[PDB]
Structure formats: structure tokens, C-alpha cells
Amino acid sequence: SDSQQSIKVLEELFQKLSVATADNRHEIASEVASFLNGNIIEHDVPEHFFGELAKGIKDKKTAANAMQAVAHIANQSNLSPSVEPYIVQLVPAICTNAGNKDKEIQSVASETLISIVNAVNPVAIKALLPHLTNAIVETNKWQEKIAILAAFSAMVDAAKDQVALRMPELIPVLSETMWDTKKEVKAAATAAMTKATETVDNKDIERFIPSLIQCIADPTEVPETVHLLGATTFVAEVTPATLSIMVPLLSRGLNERETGIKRKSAVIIDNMCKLVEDPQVIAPFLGKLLPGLKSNFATIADPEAREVTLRALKTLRRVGNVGEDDAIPELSHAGDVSTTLQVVNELLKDETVAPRFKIVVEYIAAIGADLIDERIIDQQAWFTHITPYMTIFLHEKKAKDILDEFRKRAVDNIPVGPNFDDEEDEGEDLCNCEFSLAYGAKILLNKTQLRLKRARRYGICGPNGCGKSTLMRAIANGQVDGFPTQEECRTVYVEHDIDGTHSDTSVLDFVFESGVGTKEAIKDKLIEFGFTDEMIAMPISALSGGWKMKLALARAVLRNADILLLDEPTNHLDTVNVAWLVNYLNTCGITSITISHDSVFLDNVCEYIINYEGLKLRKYKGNFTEFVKKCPAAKAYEELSNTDLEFKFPEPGYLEGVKTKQKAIVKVTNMEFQYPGTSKPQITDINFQCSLSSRIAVIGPNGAGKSTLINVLTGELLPTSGEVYTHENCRIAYIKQHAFAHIESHLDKTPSEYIQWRFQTGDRETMDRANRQINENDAEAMNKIFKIEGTPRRIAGIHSRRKFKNTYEYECSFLLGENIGMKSERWVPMMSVDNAWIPRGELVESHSKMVAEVDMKEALASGQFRPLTRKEIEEHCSMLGLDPEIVSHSRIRGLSGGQKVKLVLAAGTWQRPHLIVLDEPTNYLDRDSLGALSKALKEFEGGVIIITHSAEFTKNLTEEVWAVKDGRMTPSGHN
């Protein structure tokens, strides 16, 4: 009786509802809601009421009213399981209304979908999700898609564990939606799609994510975006969901005309798919990749594109573990809805589940599959989400008993989680993370660990071009996944900072504007560090490469950084402060990571070495020397004999006069320099020569005495006085810390376009281009009176050049001087007939241009002629460690300090040079590339000036020394 009365009340309430107006709509919707959700019917449902509601939703006149009722019925805290499934059954119709021309109906529908998503017992997801996926895929109204996308997003927060298990089904749907022509839909899909991705815990494919999204909006940007894909540095763990959005793109890329696009597509396919862990995930996509790759391998001629295409094909077959006839391996459903579904059906085998409840079991299976993906394993979590759907067709006790068994069996499928357990620990715990580095699409690391204790010294090692600098860059800026932020563990990068300070400001106020305390506290730490009262009063520009390094090392000490970072600390440091740089780290009691070239520094400091074998980070129990005992290959990697690696620099260019080494091709004398504004010159009485056999080494203390000496060697700082001598066609292959600190203004370029930038110089870098050369009277001296055939003249402008004895002669117009010494002193320009050639000498004060065109020739004989093509740039830069796949693909920004300076030296030796200087060779490169760089300097037929502090790298290589002292410098050694 009381139950039948309920049917009558609902009928009266519906009558009122179908008549409601936008005014009173919400009032009765509320009435229907509060009544329907109570214990109103004894073991049954208000069948006719749900039919009226459905018929009302499909009718223009009553759609708004009826949907608003459904909205109130589906409120976040009172939706009754007795009604829930009949509400979800209405979702498809509600979706259709979300695409209705009528402004009001469309709006109410959108709102109702959100309400339902937020109201269904999280565990009943499988009953609601299908309504939403089906609605968004068949509708053509873009506002309906945006509303549903918003509903998926709310789902992630309302039922995270359940949605996680639904990802392999959701992601493909979000990916398709990102390819919708409508720009507002693409943004919304990407956002959903971002909660979705958004699960991608890094920036490897965003640093490209914003570009990829922009691309979806404007597909004409695809070509360039494919290029940029330096490479994104795919680091995470490619999944199918991801696959639904990527494959359609890559499939067309494979069938594109340009071989370059076929090649780029394969590369992306290779990198992305080797992150597939379940073959069943990629199985449905294989048919859209295999045929294209097979066809391309047979059609393309270029061997590189072929190898790339073949590599991707092998990965696809492995991942892919592909079986006969290219069958994608059976997808395990251990995590998978099919896996949890099998589990619940087995647990329900002795229970008679009516056909009408099948949809609920499936819903329950979906929820469970997501809880597992979200790693939600406790009993209460499962009771919160699943029990409410189960009591739709089962008694509470039976439901709870089966539910608890379902959870245990499902959770038991979670893979081993075997990985390891840092906790045995030591530090105290500072940072534990399984990340994937990738500088500019270039993969430096592929799923590697990196734990670190408190108050324990370290030291990253390995060969050049591996990622030593980029690893340290991600440590500070916080690009490493899992790595704690600044508030939990503040850490301070050396010299790779970005500011905006001047070149007139001193050292004291430099560390002040940052806000690192007061001047009286900063000046106390500088004097103890090494800086004298004078060096704390001079500008940062006057500081050498060493004092700048000591400054940044001192700033890290002042900032109270828990993890001091040291990028090549011994740069220009004498045997006094080096022992202190160690003596201090030994008693500070603070953690630190030190990359270093001098192995002797790592001996007195670093207690734990972190190498770089291939793409990992195998840390070495005990220190580094103990690590060598267990792993003997940690000190014998590429010195196994290797024949396809050996190299020796090209022979130097021809130089007239240099009969002895070794081409003397450079003989300066009485060279003095005084920085305008001081009181005493930097250097003085500098006698030095250079041949085509130079084995000189500037082994000494940095600063004003050593830095200016070198700056005059290459020559940025034009010497004020003293004769300079440089043999003809002598290119000084780029060396100071100039461009080493100037490569910063070239991070947007790649290692290839860096060499093309300099040599587009010019050689323009070592042809007195670096200085001024604008001193003829120089000064007021440009008006030199040349006496030709008897009368006075002045050069108005040069024309060309031609061959002459030992130098050159240029066709230059003149200015005849009539009535000189009077008051009508005027120089009248001549014609194009009275022109007369004049020698270069003793050849720069009138022929700076005619000389440079010749020096640029013999340099291309021993660039300059070496062509600027990709292949020859690959087999050249690889010689100095730099991996080819990173040379013309990943930008310089992604390259660390070990790869930044590593490239600058590969650029100068391009044009097969006559003098190869090496400003701090061990500075950035560890022992790995140092052994190779050694032999290259031993089989070279040209000059070599190794500027270094490492007394162990000069062994059996360099003899002469350029040790400065109080300014002056007398070269000793021998030959």
C-alpha cells in the first residue's frame, strides 16, 4: 500500500513538472529529487515515471524541465542506487540534447551531464562512462563536446582509481577529439586531454606539449613541428592512449612523399613505441604502421632513412614481441577491464545475475580496473566506490564479502613495485626518483634512478656528450620528475645562471642584489675563500674564468644550499686555494655533486661517483677507485686495442718565412696592454713564438696576469703597443673563455647551425676581426700622405687585389693635394685612370681585407675548402665525442656544460687548421673523452697550445710552459 502510494505521488509530481516554466522549474525539480531518492518503493522501480522522463527529454516542449529534474535527482550526495542505473540509461538522450539548436535545451543538457558524472557511486562508472563516450563521438555540435570533455575531467577527481582502469578506453577518445576542426574543442580536449596526459609527469613531450597542441589547431605547422621534434626528449613510457592521438599522425607521416618526413616519422615511432609495455596495447595499431614502414624500407634509397625505418620496424615487432603474421601479442587484462571483469564474474559464478544487471557488473569491473591503475588498494577505498553498485542486485553482506575478495585478487595482480627499496638508506633521505632525461628530443637517459643522501660528497663522471651538464641543469631548475622543489630542498648551478647585470659593477654588490644577506656577511666569506680586499672592489668583467668560478662557489655557500653543485671547480685555481676548496668541503657538512676533469680533485673530495654508462646512472658501494676494482670495465671502455675511432688532426696551412717550427708562424715582441681606466697594465715584456709544431701549455694562476695574456694570444683585446707578427694564411683555430661564455646567446641553435653560424664566420673569427684594427694614426692618422711618382695623395677607397712578390697590391682611388701648407688646403678626388696599386705592408695598415681572403684559403687546404654539409659535419663532431644523432637534432640549450664547450672546439678545428689552442681541456671533459683528445693532439701536424691546470693531461703531450708571474711571462720548457 504505502509503496503504491509512491507511484501515485510521482505521477502528480511529474504532471506538475511537465508544466513547469523556467521560473518555477527548479522548485519542483527539487521536489521530484527529494522524493525519488528515498526508500519509496518495495523491491521495484517507478517504471512508468522513468518512461515519462525519457519521453519528456526527447520532446522540445519539455526537454528543459525533464532534464533539470534529472539534474536535481543526480546530486552529489543523495543519488539512490535504486535510481542510479535508470538515470544513467538516460545519458544517450541527454547527449543528443547537448547538440540541440535551442540555446536553453543545449545548455541544460551540458549541465546535466556534469551532474550525472559527479553523482554516480564512483564504483558505478561503467554505467555512466559509455553514455559520455558515445555522445561525444556521434554528435556534431561543438558545445556538446566541450561539456562532455568537462564531465570527463570532473570524473578524474570524483573517481580517480576507477578512471585509471578506464584509461585505455578513454585516451583514444580524447585523442580523436583533439583532431576536431573546431579550435575551442581542440583546446578543451587537450585540457581533458591534459588531466588525461596531464598524467604525463614531465615536460619531455609537452617541452613540446604546447607545440603539439598548437599543431592540432593549425596542421600546416606539422612539417616544422616534425622538425623541432628534437626530439622532445620522449622520456615517459608511451601508451596506447597516447596511441589513439599519435598513430593517425605517424601513419600519414609514413605515407608522405618527402623522404625526410618518412624518416622523421620512423624515428618518432621508434622512440614512442619502445615505451609500450603490453603488446595488447599496440596490437590494434600495428596494421597502420607495419605496412608503411615495410614499404618505406623497400622504396627509400638513403641508407640513414633506411636504418631508421628498419629500427622502428624491429621495435614494433618486438614490442613488441609481435607474433606470426605481425599479430600484436595478447594484451594482458591483469590490470585491464577484461582482467577485473574475469575476476568478478568468477566470484559471482554461484550467483544468478539477471541480464538487466550485466551492465552493472561491467561498471563495477571498470571501476576496479581504475582503482588498480591509481594504486588505490585499501579495503575502505573499494567499499566507498564499488559496494553501492553491487547492492543493486545483491544483499549488502554478500556484496561486502565478494567485494573484499575481488579487491584482494585484483590487487594481487599488481606487478612487483622487483624494483628496489632505498629506505635501507643512509641519509638521511634527500631525493629518490625514477626519471627520464631528454635534452631537446635527444635521449640522454632512458628510465634511470638517482638517489642522494644528506652530507655525502659525490661526483658525476662519464664521457663527453652523455649529459653531465644537462643532468645538473635539471637538478637545480627542477625539471627532474620526483625531485623535491625549492621549499623542501634548495640547491645551487654554477655559471649557467641568467641575469641582467652590467659590466661596470663590482664583485661585492653583485652577490648583494640577489638578497643573500648583508654586505658585511658576504665580505667575510669572500676573504676566507680567497678574494683579497682588492678583488672585491673590481668589476666582474675584470675577473678571469677562475675567480668567476670561485665566486659562484662562494655564492652557493652563502645561500645555505643543502646540495652544493660544482660544475668544474678547479677552473684556473692554483695549488693554494684548491687545497682549500677541498679543506672546506671536508668540514662544511653539506651535500655536494662535483663534475671534474682533474681526477686528483675527486680523490681528495668525492666519496661517491655517479658515472654514465650508455643511458643509465650506475652509482659507485664505496668510492670511485673501489668501483673500478669490482667493475674493471669502468676504466677500460674504448681503449680495447677501436680502430674505427682513432684520429689525428689535419696538417696546418702554408706560411711564408717559417722555415722552422711547426709553422715560427707567429712571433710577437714588446707586447704591452693597459685597460683604459686603471693605474698599471696587466701584462708586459711578453716574448713568445709559435710554429706548426707548438706544444706550449699556459700552466699557471688565472686572473689579470694570465687572462689578458691569452686574450692577446687569440687577440680580442687589441694590444695598445708593441709589434705583432702573424705569418700569412695563418688561421688561429678557435682561444680564451670568450665564446665559451658567449655560446649562451646561441641556445636556440643546434650543434650544426652553430658551426654554420660562425662560418656562414668568419676565417672571420681570427683575422683581427675580434679586436678593433681602426687605428691608422691612427688616429687623424687615416689621412696618410702617400707619395706616388712625385706628388702627395690620400686613399679615398680601395677597389680590389692581385698577386705581387711576397705580399699584395690593391687598386685604390686617391685625393690629390693642391696648394698644401696654405689656407686653401683641399683634397680633390681623382679619376678611374690615375689609380695605382700599393702593397699590403707591414701589410695591415692598408690591406686588412686583402689579407683575410688569403688566410681563408690555406686554412681550407690543410674553414674555411671544407663544405658546410650535414654528413661532413656529422663525421667531424662525432670525433670529439658529440653523438651524431644529437648534432643536428637536439638544441644547444639541452646540452650541459660538458657538451657546450665540447662543441665550440669541434667548430674551430672545422677548416682543417694552423694553431689549435685548447682553453681548459679538462675543465668540462672527464677522463672519457680526454684520452681520445690526447691522441688527436699527438698525431696532428700543427701547433697546439693547451691551456690547463691538470698536470696529468700534459704528460707525453706538451713541453713548453706559459707560467705567468706578476704580469711578465718567460716561456721555458724546450723542443
Coordinates of C-alpha atoms in Angstrom, one line a residue, residues 76-403:
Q76 CA 26.5 14.7 -5.3
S77 CA 25.3 13.5 -2.0
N78 CA 21.8 11.8 -2.4
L79 CA 21.6 9.8 -5.6
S80 CA 20.0 6.5 -4.6
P81 CA 21.3 3.2 -6.1
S82 CA 17.6 2.3 -6.6
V83 CA 17.5 5.0 -9.2
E84 CA 21.1 5.4 -10.4
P85 CA 21.1 2.9 -13.3
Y86 CA 17.8 4.3 -14.8
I87 CA 19.4 7.7 -14.6
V88 CA 22.5 6.6 -16.5
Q89 CA 20.3 4.8 -19.0
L90 CA 19.1 8.4 -20.0
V91 CA 22.5 9.7 -20.8
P92 CA 22.5 9.0 -24.5
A93 CA 19.3 11.1 -25.0
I94 CA 20.7 13.8 -22.8
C95 CA 23.8 13.8 -25.0
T96 CA 21.7 14.4 -28.1
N97 CA 20.1 17.4 -26.5
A98 CA 23.6 18.8 -25.9
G99 CA 23.7 19.4 -29.6
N100 CA 20.2 20.9 -30.0
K101 CA 19.9 24.2 -31.9
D102 CA 17.8 25.6 -29.0
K103 CA 20.0 27.7 -26.6
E104 CA 18.2 26.6 -23.5
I105 CA 17.9 22.9 -24.2
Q106 CA 21.6 22.7 -25.2
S107 CA 22.7 24.5 -22.0
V108 CA 20.6 22.4 -19.6
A109 CA 21.9 19.2 -21.2
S110 CA 25.5 20.2 -20.8
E111 CA 24.9 20.9 -17.2
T112 CA 23.0 17.7 -16.6
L113 CA 25.8 15.5 -18.0
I114 CA 28.2 17.1 -15.4
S115 CA 25.7 16.5 -12.6
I116 CA 25.4 12.8 -13.5
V117 CA 29.1 12.3 -13.8
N118 CA 29.5 13.8 -10.3
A119 CA 26.6 11.8 -8.8
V120 CA 27.2 8.2 -9.8
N121 CA 28.8 6.0 -6.7
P122 CA 32.3 6.1 -8.2
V123 CA 32.2 2.4 -8.5
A124 CA 29.3 2.6 -11.0
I125 CA 31.5 4.3 -13.6
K126 CA 30.9 1.6 -16.3
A127 CA 27.2 2.6 -16.3
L128 CA 28.0 6.3 -16.9
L129 CA 31.2 6.4 -19.0
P130 CA 29.7 4.7 -22.1
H131 CA 26.9 7.3 -22.3
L132 CA 29.6 10.1 -22.4
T133 CA 32.0 8.4 -24.9
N134 CA 29.2 7.5 -27.3
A135 CA 27.7 11.0 -27.1
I136 CA 30.9 12.9 -27.8
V137 CA 31.8 10.6 -30.8
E138 CA 28.5 10.8 -32.6
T139 CA 27.5 14.4 -32.0
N140 CA 28.4 17.2 -34.4
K141 CA 27.6 20.1 -32.0
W142 CA 30.9 21.5 -30.6
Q143 CA 29.4 22.9 -27.4
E144 CA 28.2 19.4 -26.5
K145 CA 31.7 18.1 -26.9
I146 CA 33.1 20.8 -24.7
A147 CA 30.5 19.9 -22.0
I148 CA 31.3 16.2 -22.1
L149 CA 35.0 16.9 -22.0
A150 CA 34.4 18.9 -18.9
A151 CA 32.5 15.9 -17.5
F152 CA 35.4 13.5 -18.2
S153 CA 37.6 16.0 -16.3
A154 CA 35.3 16.0 -13.3
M155 CA 35.3 12.2 -13.4
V156 CA 39.0 12.1 -12.8
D157 CA 38.6 13.9 -9.5
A158 CA 35.4 12.1 -8.4
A159 CA 36.6 8.6 -9.2
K160 CA 40.3 8.6 -9.9
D161 CA 41.0 4.9 -9.2
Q162 CA 38.1 3.8 -11.4
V163 CA 39.0 6.1 -14.2
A164 CA 42.7 4.9 -14.2
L165 CA 41.4 1.5 -15.1
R166 CA 39.4 3.0 -17.9
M167 CA 42.3 4.9 -19.5
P168 CA 43.0 2.6 -22.4
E169 CA 39.4 3.3 -23.5
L170 CA 39.3 7.0 -22.5
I171 CA 42.6 8.2 -24.0
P172 CA 41.8 7.1 -27.6
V173 CA 38.5 9.1 -27.3
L174 CA 40.3 12.2 -26.0
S175 CA 42.9 11.9 -28.8
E176 CA 40.3 11.8 -31.6
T177 CA 38.6 14.8 -30.1
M178 CA 41.9 16.7 -30.2
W179 CA 41.7 16.3 -34.0
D180 CA 38.4 18.1 -34.2
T181 CA 38.4 21.0 -36.7
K182 CA 36.9 23.4 -34.1
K183 CA 39.6 25.3 -32.3
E184 CA 37.7 25.5 -28.9
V185 CA 37.2 21.8 -29.0
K186 CA 40.9 21.1 -29.5
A187 CA 41.9 23.2 -26.6
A188 CA 39.2 21.6 -24.4
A189 CA 40.2 18.1 -25.5
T190 CA 43.9 18.9 -24.8
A191 CA 42.9 20.1 -21.3
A192 CA 40.8 17.0 -20.6
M193 CA 43.1 15.5 -22.5
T194 CA 45.7 17.2 -20.2
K195 CA 44.2 15.9 -17.0
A196 CA 44.5 12.8 -19.2
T197 CA 48.1 13.5 -20.2
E198 CA 48.1 15.7 -17.7
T199 CA 49.1 12.4 -16.1
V200 CA 52.3 12.6 -18.0
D201 CA 54.6 13.7 -15.1
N202 CA 57.2 15.6 -17.2
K203 CA 57.7 18.1 -19.9
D204 CA 59.7 16.0 -22.4
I205 CA 56.7 15.9 -24.8
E206 CA 54.6 18.9 -23.8
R207 CA 58.9 21.0 -23.9
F208 CA 56.8 20.1 -27.0
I209 CA 53.3 19.9 -25.5
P210 CA 52.3 23.4 -26.3
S211 CA 53.7 22.9 -29.8
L212 CA 51.8 19.7 -30.3
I213 CA 48.6 21.3 -29.1
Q214 CA 49.1 24.4 -31.3
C215 CA 49.7 21.9 -34.2
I216 CA 46.3 20.3 -33.7
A217 CA 44.9 23.8 -34.0
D218 CA 46.9 24.6 -37.1
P219 CA 48.0 21.4 -39.0
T220 CA 50.0 23.5 -41.5
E221 CA 52.6 23.7 -38.8
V222 CA 53.0 19.9 -38.9
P223 CA 56.2 19.9 -41.1
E224 CA 58.1 22.3 -38.8
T225 CA 56.8 20.6 -35.7
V226 CA 58.1 17.3 -37.0
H227 CA 61.4 19.0 -37.4
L228 CA 61.5 20.5 -33.9
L229 CA 60.9 17.0 -32.7
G230 CA 64.3 17.5 -31.5
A231 CA 63.4 15.4 -30.3
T232 CA 61.1 16.4 -27.4
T233 CA 63.1 14.0 -25.3
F234 CA 60.4 11.4 -25.0
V235 CA 61.2 10.1 -21.6
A236 CA 58.0 8.6 -20.2
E237 CA 56.5 5.4 -21.2
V238 CA 54.4 5.6 -24.3
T239 CA 50.9 4.1 -24.0
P240 CA 48.1 3.4 -26.5
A241 CA 46.2 6.5 -25.2
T242 CA 48.5 8.3 -26.3
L243 CA 48.4 5.9 -29.2
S244 CA 45.0 7.0 -30.3
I245 CA 46.2 10.5 -30.7
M246 CA 49.7 9.8 -32.2
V247 CA 49.3 6.9 -34.6
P248 CA 46.9 8.6 -37.0
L249 CA 49.6 11.3 -37.4
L250 CA 52.5 9.0 -37.8
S251 CA 50.6 6.7 -40.2
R252 CA 50.1 9.6 -42.6
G253 CA 53.7 10.8 -42.0
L254 CA 54.9 7.4 -43.2
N255 CA 52.9 7.6 -46.4
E256 CA 54.1 11.2 -47.1
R257 CA 56.3 12.0 -50.2
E258 CA 59.4 13.6 -48.7
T259 CA 62.0 11.0 -47.5
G260 CA 62.7 13.4 -44.7
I261 CA 59.2 13.0 -43.4
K262 CA 59.3 9.2 -43.8
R263 CA 62.5 9.3 -41.8
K264 CA 61.3 11.6 -39.0
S265 CA 58.1 9.5 -38.7
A266 CA 60.1 6.3 -38.2
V267 CA 62.3 8.0 -35.5
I268 CA 59.2 9.1 -33.5
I269 CA 57.6 5.7 -33.9
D270 CA 60.7 4.0 -32.6
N271 CA 61.1 6.3 -29.5
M272 CA 57.5 6.2 -28.6
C273 CA 56.7 2.6 -29.1
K274 CA 59.6 1.1 -27.2
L275 CA 57.8 2.6 -24.2
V276 CA 54.9 0.2 -24.8
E277 CA 54.9 -2.5 -22.1
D278 CA 51.8 -4.6 -23.1
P279 CA 51.6 -5.8 -26.7
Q280 CA 47.8 -5.8 -26.5
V281 CA 48.0 -2.1 -26.1
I282 CA 49.7 -1.6 -29.5
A283 CA 48.1 -4.6 -31.3
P284 CA 45.1 -2.7 -32.8
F285 CA 47.5 0.0 -34.1
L286 CA 50.1 -2.3 -35.7
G287 CA 48.2 -2.6 -39.0
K288 CA 48.6 1.2 -39.5
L289 CA 52.4 1.2 -39.0
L290 CA 53.9 -2.1 -40.2
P291 CA 52.9 -1.8 -43.9
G292 CA 54.1 1.8 -44.2
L293 CA 57.5 1.0 -42.6
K294 CA 57.9 -2.1 -44.8
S295 CA 57.0 -0.1 -47.9
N296 CA 59.4 2.7 -47.0
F297 CA 62.3 0.4 -46.4
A298 CA 62.0 -1.0 -49.9
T299 CA 61.3 2.4 -51.5
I300 CA 63.9 4.7 -49.9
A301 CA 67.4 4.8 -51.2
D302 CA 69.1 6.9 -48.5
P303 CA 70.8 4.4 -46.1
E304 CA 70.2 6.6 -43.0
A305 CA 66.4 6.8 -43.6
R306 CA 66.6 3.0 -44.2
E307 CA 68.3 2.2 -41.0
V308 CA 65.9 4.4 -39.0
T309 CA 62.9 2.8 -40.8
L310 CA 64.3 -0.7 -40.1
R311 CA 65.0 0.1 -36.5
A312 CA 61.4 1.2 -35.9
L313 CA 60.2 -1.9 -37.6
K314 CA 62.2 -4.1 -35.3
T315 CA 61.0 -2.3 -32.2
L316 CA 57.4 -2.6 -33.4
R317 CA 57.8 -6.4 -33.9
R318 CA 59.4 -6.8 -30.5
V319 CA 57.0 -4.6 -28.6
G320 CA 56.8 -5.5 -29.3
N321 CA 57.2 -9.3 -29.2
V322 CA 55.0 -9.5 -32.3
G323 CA 54.0 -12.9 -33.4
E324 CA 53.2 -14.7 -36.6
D325 CA 51.7 -12.6 -39.4
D326 CA 52.5 -9.5 -37.4
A327 CA 49.9 -10.3 -34.7
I328 CA 50.0 -8.0 -31.7
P329 CA 50.7 -10.0 -28.6
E330 CA 47.7 -10.9 -26.5
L331 CA 47.1 -7.9 -24.2
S332 CA 47.1 -9.0 -20.5
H333 CA 44.0 -7.8 -18.8
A334 CA 45.5 -8.3 -15.3
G335 CA 45.1 -4.6 -14.6
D336 CA 42.6 -4.1 -17.8
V337 CA 38.9 -4.2 -17.5
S338 CA 38.9 -7.6 -19.0
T339 CA 41.2 -8.7 -16.1
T340 CA 39.0 -7.3 -13.3
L341 CA 35.8 -8.4 -15.2
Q342 CA 37.1 -12.0 -15.2
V343 CA 37.8 -11.8 -11.5
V344 CA 34.3 -10.6 -10.5
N345 CA 32.5 -13.0 -12.8
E346 CA 34.4 -15.9 -11.2
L347 CA 33.5 -14.6 -7.8
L348 CA 29.8 -14.3 -9.0
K349 CA 29.7 -17.7 -10.6
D350 CA 27.3 -19.2 -8.0
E351 CA 25.2 -16.1 -8.0
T352 CA 22.4 -15.8 -10.6
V353 CA 22.9 -12.4 -12.2
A354 CA 19.9 -11.4 -14.3
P355 CA 20.6 -9.9 -17.8
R356 CA 19.4 -6.5 -16.7
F357 CA 22.3 -6.4 -14.2
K358 CA 25.0 -7.3 -16.7
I359 CA 25.7 -3.6 -17.3
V360 CA 26.3 -3.1 -13.6
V361 CA 28.9 -5.9 -13.3
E362 CA 30.7 -4.4 -16.2
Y363 CA 30.6 -1.0 -14.5
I364 CA 31.9 -2.5 -11.3
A365 CA 34.7 -4.1 -13.3
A366 CA 35.7 -0.8 -14.9
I367 CA 35.8 1.0 -11.5
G368 CA 38.0 -1.8 -10.1
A369 CA 40.4 -1.6 -13.1
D370 CA 40.9 2.1 -12.5
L371 CA 41.4 1.7 -8.7
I372 CA 44.3 -0.6 -9.6
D373 CA 45.8 1.8 -12.1
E374 CA 45.6 4.6 -9.5
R375 CA 47.1 2.2 -7.0
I376 CA 44.2 2.5 -4.5
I377 CA 44.3 -0.8 -2.7
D378 CA 42.9 -0.4 0.8
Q379 CA 39.6 -2.0 1.8
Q380 CA 37.7 1.2 2.6
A381 CA 38.5 2.7 -0.7
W382 CA 37.0 -0.2 -2.6
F383 CA 33.9 -0.2 -0.3
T384 CA 33.4 3.5 -1.0
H385 CA 33.4 3.0 -4.7
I386 CA 32.1 -0.4 -5.6
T387 CA 29.6 -1.7 -2.9
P388 CA 26.9 0.8 -3.9
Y389 CA 26.7 -0.6 -7.4
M390 CA 26.7 -4.2 -6.1
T391 CA 23.7 -3.8 -3.8
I392 CA 21.7 -3.0 -6.9
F393 CA 21.3 -6.8 -7.3
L394 CA 22.9 -8.3 -4.2
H395 CA 22.4 -8.1 -0.4
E396 CA 24.9 -6.0 1.5
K397 CA 26.7 -8.8 3.3
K398 CA 27.2 -11.0 0.3
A399 CA 28.3 -7.9 -1.6
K400 CA 30.9 -6.9 1.0
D401 CA 32.2 -10.4 1.3
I402 CA 32.7 -10.7 -2.5
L403 CA 33.9 -7.2 -2.8

